[PDB]
Structure formats: structure tokens, C-alpha cells
Design a protein around this ligand. Sequence first.
Ligand code: HEM
Length: 404
Amino acid sequence: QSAAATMPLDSIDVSIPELFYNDSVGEYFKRLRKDDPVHYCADSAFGPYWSITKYNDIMHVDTNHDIFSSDAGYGGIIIDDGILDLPNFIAMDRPRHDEQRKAVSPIVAPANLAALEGTIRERVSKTLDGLPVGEEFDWVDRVSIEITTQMLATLFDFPFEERRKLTRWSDVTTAAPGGGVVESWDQRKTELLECAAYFQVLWNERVNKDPGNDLISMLAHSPATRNMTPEEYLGNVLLLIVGGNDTTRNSMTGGVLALHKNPDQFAKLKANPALVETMVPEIIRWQTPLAHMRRTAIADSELGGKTIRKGDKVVMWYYSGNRDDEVIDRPEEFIIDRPRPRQHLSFGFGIHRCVGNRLAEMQLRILWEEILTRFSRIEVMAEPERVRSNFVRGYAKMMVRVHA
Ligand code: HEM
């Protein structure tokens, strides 16, 4: 591959998934932020697109939804244009998005989340109490996937023993025949109707009981949801499951890798466990579990001296903006005690900013509070295998050992 530092600017294609896989893409982003920060690529595997590489420019795009649209009709919200017809509120503009999002934001209520803490902690405690000590195991399988699946079961108060159903339904939602996940579109449809039937049982059992602190109770007792159709219910449930699943997984894996690579920060965290609160947002900045989101321009506009034309694909590279030293001090450093650790892009900004963020951060905080009480070190034994994606910045496997 060409040297990012000196190659022609017009040869730089940051969408190439291999560059995320081998984790060199950061070098190309570094070159763009310095030398062409609103960067047009005329030809790629995804078609032509703009790369928005700097923190303030990315915020401008994300918070200007009347110019930069998320609508599924234009191709949706990933660089790769999109294809059972369920409303998908992340790929929707005003006014429809707002009522679908308002249904669900009870999950943003700190009051509500506070009621889940004890359940989260007991579930994390049991997993960590079961890990081998001094023996190698796959952190991704044993902790990240396991704990994320708990977090979704907690959110829905889903029958805990059946929680693997949630990750199966997550896998099916983005599957296509030939992939070895589903063998046909019928099977996929059949499984997602089984999901709708299950969640409908849950709703039927809860609507006439005192409400719990889970989402299904809250939706069922909330007067705002009177006119919520079964398609909206299923679309909301699958969007939450997908939105929470790999992002939280990769944040759980990422913070272990960061602390291994910065053992001085891990020394500071053990000496002051209260830093868990300011460390969790740093993990999320450092990992940038979703590396981009995309938009489509619906009107000409100017950005960074460039004209972005109506119809053009515009890619907000959150992973780049989270390395932008004009906003973030020493951005390549993992620092668990920054003064404003929530100054990052990993959750986006604007009307589509992550609705799950407070639940993710609570889950991550409780995870680490519970690690710190148990283990003196979490040692990464081999370079983890990364995911080959330009969207998911994540890890398929990471071998570790824990020490008492
Ligand atoms: C560290 C974990 C997470 C990260 C890094 C993350 C990231 C993001 C990003 C980048 C967006 C779009 C932001 C934008 O376009 O401006 C988003 C939206 C969203 N996320 Fe999260 N997310 C995480 C966890 C969660 C969790 C735990 C849930 C569910 C419980 C969730 C549910 C959603 C939903 C439903 C949306 C769509 C919001 C809307 O369109 O109004 N996410 N997330």
C-alpha cells in the first residue's frame, strides 16, 4: 500500500476495509486532516463520497439534518447504500424520526437507569466470578459478548436464561442468504416474526401489571405510545438491539486493550478507582466503535471551502475527528483523567445522537468497578484479530489472562 504521508491526495481512499483490518487507516486520516480535511473521493467500491475528517466539520454535518439527510430513500446512514418492511428510525428525517425517538428516550432518564444498577452489577459479578484465573481465554467471547447480551436482557427485562435469542435476532437483522447466518429470506422473515411474537407476549403480560423499570413495561404504560403499531414496536426493538450490540461489545474489549498498552493509566486507575467515571468516555473515544456515519446532501452547501453538491454522499469519520488535535489535546494518548472526557464524537451529535449512550456508559462503569475489585491485571496475550469493516471498529477475538 502507498505511504499516506506523501502519496497523491486524490489516490487516498479511506473506505477500504482492509485499512481498518490492519489498523493503518489512521495514518491516511492524519494526512487528510492536515492537507485536505474535507476530502472528495471520485471513485471507490462504494461510489464517490466526501470524507469529513475534522471534529468541528463533522459536528456541523451531524447537526445540520435539513442539509445532510439520513433518509433510507437516499441510501441511509452507512457509506454502503442500503437494500419485511419495518421503520428504521436512524434512517429517517424529521418529522417522523422525532416521535419514534421520543417513544424510547425513557432509557435516557438517569432516574430510570439508576433503578437498573443492582441488576447490572449482580449480572456482571457472576460472569467475572466465573472466569479462569491465570489461564488464557477469549475476552471477546467470555466477557464482551456475554456482558452485552446481559445489558440488552436488562433493558427489556428479557427472560434471562433465553437472552441468546437477542443476539440471534441481532445477527438475523443484518444477514443475507449465502452468509451462513440465514439460509433464505423466508427464514430471516420467519425469525424476525418470532421476535415480534415474543416481544408481543412480553408486552401483553406487562401492559396490565404495575410497570417495571424495563423498556417494554415503560412503552406499554406510556400514553405517548397509544398509536404505536406493531411494525414500529418491532422496528424500535431491533434498532435498539443492533445499536447496542456491537458498539458496547467493542468498547468492552477496547478498554482492556487500551489499559494493557498504557499500564501507567492502569496504575492510576487502581490507585484511584473513582477514575472509572472519566475513564469510560475515554475508552469510547479511543475505540470509536462506529468509525463513521453517513449522510446524503439534499441542497448545495459550503464546508471547509468546498462545495458539497445536492445528491453527494457525505461521510462523517468519527474515528478521525476523535483524533483531531485542534479540539482534543494529545488525541493519540489514552488518558483516563481528562478534564472533559465526554468531548468526543463516538455518539454523534444532533437529532440522531446515540439514544443509548447513558446505558452503555453505566454498563461499562459497573464492568470496570467490578474488574477492579477482583483482578490486579488483565494481560493481553496476543494482538487481537480486528474486524474487516469501515463501519465497525472492533475485535472478533482477543486472548487474555486475568491475575488475582
Ligand atoms: C459505546 C456504545 C455506543 C456507541 C459508540 C454508539 C454509537 C452511535 C452512533 C455513532 C449513533 C448515530 C449518531 C449520529 O448519527 O449522530 C448512534 C445512534 C443510536 N444508537 Fe448508539 N451507540 C452505542 C450504544 C448504544 C446502545 C447501548 C443502544 C441501545 C440501548 C444504542 C442505540 C442507538 C439508537 C436507537 C440510535 C439511533 C438514534 C436516532 O436515530 O435518533 N446505542 N449510536
